[PDB]
Amino acid sequence: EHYIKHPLQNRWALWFFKNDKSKTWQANLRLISKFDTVEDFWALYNHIQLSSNLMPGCDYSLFKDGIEPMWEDEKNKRGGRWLITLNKQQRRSDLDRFWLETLLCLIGESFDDYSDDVCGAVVNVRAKGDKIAIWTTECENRDAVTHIGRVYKERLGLPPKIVIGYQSHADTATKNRFVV
Template identity: 50%
Template sequence: MSEIVVQTNRSVENDEQSQQIASTSRSSSLVSEIQTKHPLQNTWELWYYKNISLNFEQNLFKITSVDTVEDFWGLFNNIEFANKLSQNCGYYFFKKGIRPMWEDNANRNGGRWFFNLKKTNLTDEYWLEVLLCLIGEGFGDYNDSICGAFVLIKKNQNRIGIWTKDANHRDANMHIGNVFKQRTSYFGMINFEPHDNTKEVSYQV
């Protein structure tokens, strides 16, 4: 009889240990899933722009950088919506190492696609779509031609745009312009301007 009791107790202990091991395993898997982050192909830096000086560089303030999907959403969900920024303020979202200035070596020969829109909540929708296109490498063979994007809040309208590296690379710029228009579903004309206004380059989509 005592043998049966001992064996039964051992069986109960084994079952409890098995349950504890299974529970620990599930907890470890859950923690692992929570801790796993999805890296982006590029690291991106968010800059805040506030027009307080005639010196453009002094108007730029680097906020932070992101290199995973989770970090991007953590940033986006905790900053002010673009449409709620004060007049003459904005955001620049650029690849790490590229300053959002025409004088930067990566931008010197480039240009920008942009469009203007009235001050509505569409600004935030368009801006998010552009950001997702950037971090998702949505420009196909021409992702390397992308420098960054911007949104600026003006008095009567807002402006959203994308900066590219080479104003003379027609194929790259036209592809980027078309993707820009398709992803935002913008219904009007989108124009491209080189940073160097002496360049005789003009694109439209």
């Protein structure tokens, strides 16, 4: 009642990446903490830096517990990502609101029967332009990928004029598979 936390459908892990050239890419990836209730999500979100305030070269990742935010995870190797590319002006205007909306689409299971295809999301803070992406587990599942892309674009509020693409991790690791 007035004392039980509200369990989320999934337990989530927040990851941090800091670009450091002394280390391999994988060694720069670090798990911050995990949560599985509404209350613990907000406690964590409220304690950490907004993405717009991180140094260029850093990432946040939020993934279902047990899935690492890397292509080589069994749940990512056959998958891909719906990519949101932000210009440098949208660092100020949309980065933080887009990322929080992305976080909520994940923990709120916003993609109906296809929320099981979601692995996680990643925001890259970069000088050349930031990126936000939702990662899904199977790039050949056209129906799941397309529905997630349509729900995502509308939850972000992007105008029907704007087009976003989905790329497979196989292609990234070595073009768009889908567009909405």
